[model samples]
Target: PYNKIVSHLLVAEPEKIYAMPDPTVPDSDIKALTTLCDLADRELVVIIGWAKHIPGFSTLSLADQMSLLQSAWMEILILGVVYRSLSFEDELVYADDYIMDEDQSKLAGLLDLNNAILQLVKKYKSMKLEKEEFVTLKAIALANSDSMHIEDVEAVQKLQDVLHEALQDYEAGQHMEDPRRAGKMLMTLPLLRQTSTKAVQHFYNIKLEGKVPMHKLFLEMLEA
Candidate 1:
């Protein structure tokens, strides 16, 4: 039930590893994986930095905050990658040079995972997901503690209600005519959860196989 990110990562100079061996090369499967792990490290940092700017994040108790962060990290990562991959239906754009093509996904043993990602991206693209809504997804995701052990579930649930209502306001306020819009976005959550579960399992399997090391933040958050 608690499939999570693996252990072992660094604090600074994430992109330093961008000197990655060309993943597109047929002989570079391990390199492709290493590059993707580097990108994960970088993105994990990005998510933490972006958290402080969240509208109501600072109000939560630290324990509650950490709970939300640990709970939401994987889904948020899935969401971020979905947002980035919006421009390309079949490619997961982890970075400028670290795009995951069908071949790269296959090489990384992520063929099924990549397909779920692509399908979700296509759904979002077709829904015409905007930057405003994308940030809402990111922020709301953190407030959603799901089933995590929060210090104060009542307080956290109240905050999540407020956040959800705000997003609901946006969908209806902007598209009063198209009532289905909000529903479409809400449905994506279950799908995001499914994708994230698969992704965590994928990483866990890779770690057990000794294919890649997990990020330090990943280990810390998992411990939360």
Candidate 2:
């Protein structure tokens, strides 16, 4: 099932929270998400100003877009979980006013977004492990040394050890049916949640405020 590719999301049902359009833009969920990623990556002041300059966001200032992206990226993670479950039937849940409201000072929407990620991991931990292994193993292989010598063998063995440890941790959390042990394993979730939250806040401070370049962030984060 993981190998199958789905083309499109299903149309939203009438009672769904995403039925209404973003009062400010003609963009749909995909458009808004794509634009948000681009904005975060480009750190485009004028474009950000324009997006915030729109009717509803004018009060929040362009800085809010960073938090919005953080919130939205969590949703994207949720979408991934849904896609894993629903496959071709996975529909994009477009957030209307209440859902995307960055106007709220407390960031309730962002909390909801974070909760969604947690819920996804909780619902289907095995699926999450599979996805992570697929992505991370490839990245490690691609980035590490390519020489086919004793050093290369050691490196490969080290990588394998890392993967094995990861799988062990995953199994400790996911497959073990013991309630007390499961409780201990569940601690991993909070660490992951806090780390993700911190990363988003750090990005907001450095990237959105123009203190750091976007490519630099990617290099430091993704390519490191």
Candidate 3:
């Protein structure tokens, strides 16, 4: 499962996502806003397409998958953004060449989210978060979904339990170092979810601010 997921993950991501605009477009500029929205649309396509290749995910009902996505995609998207930025001590990697700093975030009225994401990444980096740990945790997060309209909450939860065991197996198989990392990683989900919620709100307003219409893919996810 580990090998499969990691390989699929690598293959699934694009070689280069649409480059973030150079010359840093202003926060309120329609071009900047459109590019950001388009970038998100592309990213969501990658995420949803990649998810179908996840180990147990293919077995999930189409409805179940949509339910899971509706509940957790924003959180997952934030987590992915944070993971890419792990190498940079303090940047939010919007895309290739689109690294955002505190000032830009503030200008966009996103200082709150910017701070929250950086702070969370600070903690995760401190843990020396590994690729394996990240991929597993993401699946764990997806499986943990418990949307009100879901048909099989019990089954979904058990999948999470199985992933918990999967995580343990990998950690225990390795040397006896940093046993507490998994616990710490799990503890951050709510923070991730919190930021995702806040982040989505900004995009929601970004769309409503209406210099451009959000692509249907993003509109659907945001609306859901």
Candidate 4:
């Protein structure tokens, strides 16, 4: 059930967000930035939709569902970026046309956070992650109960357990001789969480600069 749902979500190929400089738009830089935020808004909606369609997700209480989304959305966003940027080494690619190099990221004061993201991307690439593994990790990330307002912590934990077991089953089936592979993959979750937290902080910092107009959907996701 878990695999089927995750596979379905993977096939959706959510829209990409890019900030391209255009001469027609006055203040093109800001326009590009706003467009980037718009992309995030749309991407978050697609991710939320993916979670909603998962079996048993809608069964959770509304409050719990919101809590999970709040706790997991940023992480899921970061995971999506990591997956998309896997093809690049020196720069991070936001979309086919938009690539951010270290200097560009440094100007935004995200050099450290960008480096962390790059490291994680490199690590995951080294792991030779399959689509099933990535989706399973996303499911585990989405089932979190780290929010203080979550009323049913036990229920969330159970969901996480089921997701983790599914990941383990995949690891066993794929690499039966190397039992430690699963442990190694699981260990990366803490790093992903930490990196995602930093990413959220950086995002808010950008918002405070008043250069980019944040989309309403992106704001709502932050508030959620």
Candidate maximizing lDDT = 4
Top-down TM-score ranking: 3, 4, 1, 2
Tell me the tens digit of each residue's lDDT in model 4 across 117-137: 888889989988776778778
| Per-prediction TM-score to the true structure, in the order listed | 0.79, 0.26, 0.82, 0.81
Q: lDDT tens digits, residues 1-224, model 2?
A: 22111000011111222233345765454444444454333333322332232222234322332333323343233333332332211122223222332222123223444444445445445333454332322222222313232223443455435543443454455455643433343343443445445545744653443566543443243222
Which residue ranges in model 1 land beyond 4 Å of their true spot?
1-27, 208-224
Error of 4 at 219 (Å): 11
TM-score attained by model 2 = 0.26
lDDT of 3 by residue, 1-224 (tens): 44444445556544457646645655564555666666776777767766676666667776777777777777777787788889896688877667778877766676888799998789888877787777777777777755667776766777787777777766666525767656777898888878887887887765533554334444454334
Deviation in angstroms for 71 in model 4? 1.3
lDDT of residue 213 for candidate 3: 36
lDDT of 1 at 190: 82
Error of 1 at 166 (Å): 1.9
Q: Which candidate model has the greater TM-score, 2 or 3?
A: 3
- lDDT tens digits, residue span 119-211, model 1: 889899989897656767766667764845777877777877766676677776777778878677878888887888888887777673253
Q: Pick the candidate with the highest TM-score.
A: 3
